[PDB]
Amino acid sequence: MRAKWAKKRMRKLKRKRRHMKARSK
């Protein structure tokens, strides 16, 4: 399910991006 797997990669990047934002908050 490439659409499903693509939204899982987006969700992973969005988790890492929000976490990195928090380190520099």
Partner RNA sequence: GGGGACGGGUGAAACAGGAUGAUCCCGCCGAGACCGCCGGCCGCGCAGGCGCCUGCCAAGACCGCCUCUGUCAAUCAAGGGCGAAGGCCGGGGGCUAGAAGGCGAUCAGACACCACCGUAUUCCCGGCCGUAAACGGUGCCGCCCCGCGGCCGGCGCGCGCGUCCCGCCGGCCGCCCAGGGAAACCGGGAGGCUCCGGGCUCUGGGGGGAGUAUGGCCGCAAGGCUGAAACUUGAAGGCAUUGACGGAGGGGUACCACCAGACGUGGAGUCUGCGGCUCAAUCUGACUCAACGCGCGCACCUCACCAGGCCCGGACGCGCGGAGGACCGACAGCCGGGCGCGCUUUCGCGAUCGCGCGGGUGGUGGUGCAUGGCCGCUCCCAGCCCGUGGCGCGAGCCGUCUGCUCCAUUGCGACAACGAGCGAGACCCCGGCCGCGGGCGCCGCGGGACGGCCCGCGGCAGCGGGAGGACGGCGGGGCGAUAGCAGGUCUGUGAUGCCCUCAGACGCCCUGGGCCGCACGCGCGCUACACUGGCGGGGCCAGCCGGCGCCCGCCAGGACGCGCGGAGCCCCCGCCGUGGCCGGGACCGCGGGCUGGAACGCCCCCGCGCACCAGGAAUGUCUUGUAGGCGCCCGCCCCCACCGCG
C-alpha separations of 5 from 9, 15, 25 in Å: 6, 15, 30
- Output 11 or 23, the one with its CB closest to RNA: 11
Question: Which spans of this chain sit near RNA (rule: CB under 7 A)?
Answer: 6-7, 10-15, 17-18, 21
- Output 18 or 23, the one with its CB closest to RNA: 18
Please return the burial class of 15, using the count of CB atoms within 10 Å of its CB with bins 0-12, 13-18 and 19+: exposed
CB of 22 to RNA, least distance (A): 10
One-letter amino acid at 5 equals: W
CB of 18 to RNA, least distance (A): 6
